[PDB]
Design a protein around this ligand. Structure first.
Ligand code: NA
Ligand code: NA
Lengths: 358, 358
């Protein structure tokens, strides 16, 4: 195509690898020259912004590189000299990098990313990333919430058309969704919370240290983002009630292994609350809630009648219910909210969106 | 890209009126100028291609206009003299208008529309639109399937990134959705088909003459569209199995009164199919289905488990299930699938997605 955009990638992790794969295989009218690939200290950099001749097994080419990664300030300066609109893809979860988004944006560099950090920081940095200055680059982050699901794009669309979001309620975590779906079920089950958590770990459905999936911290970030888009100036992921499923007695312990090894000793506590559902035929489930009218945001265990939808989800599917002035009966979008492929496509979906816009 | 886009609108009915109000009250960076508006024989057109001097007051002005409505050919020609990129928004359901999309597109005039005719008719008309001529305008038709629900945009993107659709199940009719949600539940009542349809009509959930809903034609057109987007070369909305709910005799009923009162005369069949389903813990749902591997599309009644997301819909929400190579667990998107404002928002969303390009 006559249209050309240069893509600067960072992150060759699980998501990132899937991304690159999907990008390099996408045949499109528009032309996407991969001008940079960085993973930790190594990098493949095309000084003159022509497309890197990587192709198949970029992982290897990257691995064979003698090029050291540029410090972000230097990266920005470099990217500034680009002859064509630049899109920076950040497939990490780095705070450092996120800490640079405003520098990127104000310098004409657009960003596409699944990295929730920059969007779950202080409101000031948020307002800055979306000021739409003439000289600013575009900022898309669909993968930030629900992964590939059209959560952010839909919210932004209906708000532009004149709609007013009233309430959001959803399960925004694949790990926590998998867990409760197995633990708390319509049938009076008997599975020990710690058991499904051990399954979640081994099936790869969980972060190295499951405490990182259990502190709710991640769900709070996502809800901060949806809350801010819905019109609620959430100050941060800690400025509202968030319930950590971590047993106080183990907040101490150093080894993730020790934690998981002792997690069972507290099953009788969580099983209690699942047993106290009986208050109506109800099931428990970790959710993120946002009430616009009263600026109320929160994340923690919630209970629904065996008959409610949340009581019958799929594997790690994590749904979200959007109630707006126009949508009296909420919009419910559900599906996989984790996984390299699904997540990466959400990121590529955003890259196409930016490129068509440049 | 352009900061000014001239909009030409045809049709100010239920969705159009709401479309026009929303467009004209839209807060936006870009400037959207309404240069031409046409309803029946009346039309408003500014030869300057400058904003129509009506403010938000377009309906009154239009109702008073003495200016005749331009022959499509002349409208194509006229829009070809717009100082700024043009977006045509066809809020009709005219097959006539549809027959001209090719020409509009072929002349760099973009289209945003709720009209299904052009995408649910001939198959070449379909391949025509979606050719990669390098000059032709863009074509967006979100409101043709799940009203404002991000159904079409989601498919296109997922496909672009490399995912492959495998199976699609969906309830694409508000009327039929409401009816079956009321008729068939897990409660297994004695509610008669006739009754619900009568109440649906009573509460204004159907067309004046309910045969227009029960015929399942609007659903086949919608399924044809997602079938083709998915990769199934569907010839027409009548080239595959489509189950009508109008009793074999009342299709020649004459009065639209006869039909409604004489309906009850065939409740027995549905009420038994409903009894057979309950016994199996299934619920009856009217749906449109697409199995890509076997290239088989269909419309009719299918049984669903009480635990299936379809057996718990609310009011008249539409719902779509999309199973893909990547999503081994179908993505499910539900919400209102009709309504003036909601459908307008969808059309405007496309208008916005178009203007951002250009
Ligand atoms: Na998302
Ligand atoms: Na739609």
């Amino acid at each position: 195509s006559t249209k050309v955009v240069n893509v600067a990638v960072i992150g060759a992790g699980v998501v990132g690898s899937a991304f690159l794969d999907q990008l390099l295989a996408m045949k499109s009218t528009i032309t996407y020259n991969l001008v940079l690939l960085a993973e930790a200290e190594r990098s493949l950099i095309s000084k003159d912004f022509s497309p890197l001749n990587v192709g198949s097994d970029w992982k290897a080419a990257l691995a064979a590189s003698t090029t050291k990664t540029l410090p972000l300030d230097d990266l920005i300066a470099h990217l500034k000299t680009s002859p064509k609109p630049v899109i920076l893809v950040d497939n990490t979860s780095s705070a450092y990098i996120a800490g640079f988004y405003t520098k990127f944006v104000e310098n004409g560099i657009s960003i596409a990313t699944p990295n929730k950090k920059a969007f779950s920081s202080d409101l000031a940095t948020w307002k800055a990333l979306f000021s739409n200055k003439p000289t600013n680059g575009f900022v898309y982050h669909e993968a930030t919430v629900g992964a590939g699901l059209p959560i952010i794009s839909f919210l932004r669309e209906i708000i532009q058309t004149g709609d007013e979001v009233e309430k959001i309620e959803g399960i925004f975590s694949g790990t926590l969704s998998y867990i409760f779906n197995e633990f708390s079920t319509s049938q009076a089950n008997d599975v020990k919370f710690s058991d499904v958590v051990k399954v979640a770990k081994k099936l790869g459905y969980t972060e190295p240290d499951p405490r990182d999936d259990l502190n709710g911290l991640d769900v709070a970030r996502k809800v901060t983002i949806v809350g801010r888009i819905s019109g609620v100036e959430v100050e941060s992921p800690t400025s509202f009630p968030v319930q950590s499923l971590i047993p106080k007695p183990l907040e101490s312990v150093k080894s993730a292994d020790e934690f998981l090894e002792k997690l069972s000793d507290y099953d009788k506590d969580l099983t209690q609350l699942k047993k106290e559902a009986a208050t109506e035929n109800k099931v428990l489930r970790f959710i993120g809630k946002v009430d616009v009218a009263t600026k109320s945001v929160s994340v923690g265990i919630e209970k629904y009648d065996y008959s409610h939808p949340f009581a019958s989800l799929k594997g790690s599917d994590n749904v979200i219910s959007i109630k707006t002035k126009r949508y009296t009966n909420p919009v419910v979008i559900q599906g996989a909210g984790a996984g390299a492929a699904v997540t990466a496509a959400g990121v590529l979906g955003d890259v196409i969106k930016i490129a068509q816009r440049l």
